[PDB]
Write a protein that binds this ligand. Structure first.
Ligand SMILES: COc1cc2c(Nc3ccc(Sc4nccn4C)c(Cl)c3)c(C#N)cnc2cc1OCCCN(C)CCO
Length: 302
């Protein structure tokens, strides 16, 4: 049967519904239900791969479907070791399938919460630098390809079986080749606690604002996923941040990681570090594998 899937996805991202086997439910997803499972011959040199599978059911408007596909279409553009990668979509069938790289340990937020005692030290500075570095790497790729994530936060990063952290959710990211910015016209649903002052004020999003968010996820990592500006309301956070407010250094936070935050929170966007700069300052503290797999140390980067 002919559906949006047939036109809106290059058949060069297609894979036979027979190659894809679903096992158990992982959870709800933006446009359908996500399943863990296996995808034969989708990864070069793998006879089999573990993957996450999303199912869009007939019971979803064509509008719904089209947008959903277009969102995935941007994914396609990205090929970075620290971005969750799209493995392909099954388009000739009754429930459209999207096949993503499996991240066995789920979202960085939940993962961080799992480290707490049971209703409060943070990971070791070394574990933390690795996360910070792997997140910064993905973002630097994003920015090199002229995108603004807009929605960077612990809840949007995934953690792989080997504890590698990757950027994961791009429903909110925009193209910025020419302009180097995105301006929000109407109502926005982005959480205010991750938003840069300039973004709260004008609706402007740049890579400088991404770096601001990055600081906040460093803060989330440090506090094992506390709510930023706890004790303030969205109202007060708004006011507080725009007028120069800053998150307090976590109790138990190694100075270094909080210095890094304080630079990502420079009020003047132009005074913040680039994702490349950030990586540079800690690249010598990253587990060996990094050099091989990172975008920082890749050909694309120069
Ligand atoms: C918890 O649910 C999970 C969702 C995942 C996921 N999500 C996902 C999101 C969107 C799509 S399709 C889509 N919709 C909009 C855009 N796109 C591409 C797909 Cl296919 C998967 C992707 C990925 N990616 C990769 N890995 C995942 C692992 C999950 O859990 C296993 C461990 C949890 N665990 C049990 C923790 C301990 O309890």
């Amino acid at each position: 049967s002919f559906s949006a899937a047939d036109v809106y996805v290059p058949d060069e991202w297609e894979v036979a519904r027979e190659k894809i086997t679903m096992s158990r439910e992982l959870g709800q997803g933006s446009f359908g239900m996500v399943y863990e499972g296996v995808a034969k011959g989708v990864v070069k040199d793998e006879p089999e791969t573990r993957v996450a599978i999303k199912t869009v059911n007939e019971a979803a408007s064509m509008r719904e479907r089209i947008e959903f596909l277009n969102e995935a279409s941007v994914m396609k553009e990205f090929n970075c070791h620290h971005v969750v990668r799209l493995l392909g979509v099954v388009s000739q069938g009754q429930p459209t399938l999207v096949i993503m790289e499996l991240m066995t340990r789920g979202d960085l937020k939940s993962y961080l919460r799992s480290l707490r005692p049971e209703m409060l030290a943070p990971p070791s500075l070394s574990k933390m630098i690795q996360m910070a570095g792997e997140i910064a790497d993905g973002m630097a790729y994003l920015n090199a390809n002229k995108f603004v994530h807009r929605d960077l936060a612990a809840r949007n990063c995934m953690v792989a079986e080997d504890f590698t952290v990757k950027i994961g959710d791009f429903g909110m990211t925009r193209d910025i080749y020419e302009t180097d910015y995105y301006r929000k016209g109407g109502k926005g649903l982005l959480p205010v606690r991750w938003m840069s002052p300039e973004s709260l004020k004008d609706g402007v999003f740049t890579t400088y604002s991404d770096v601001w968010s990055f600081g906040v996820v460093l803060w989330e990592i440090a506090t094992l996923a506390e709510q930023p500006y706890q004790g303030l309301s969205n109202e007060q956070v708004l006011r507080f941040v725009m007028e120069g407010g800053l998150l307090d250094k976590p109790d138990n936070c190694p100075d270094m990681l909080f210095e890094l935050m304080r630079m990502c929170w420079q009020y003047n966007p132009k005074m913040r570090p680039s994702f490349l700069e950030i990586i540079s300052s800690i690249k010598e503290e990253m587990e060996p594998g990094f050099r091989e797999v990172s975008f920082y140390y890749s050909e694309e980067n120069k």
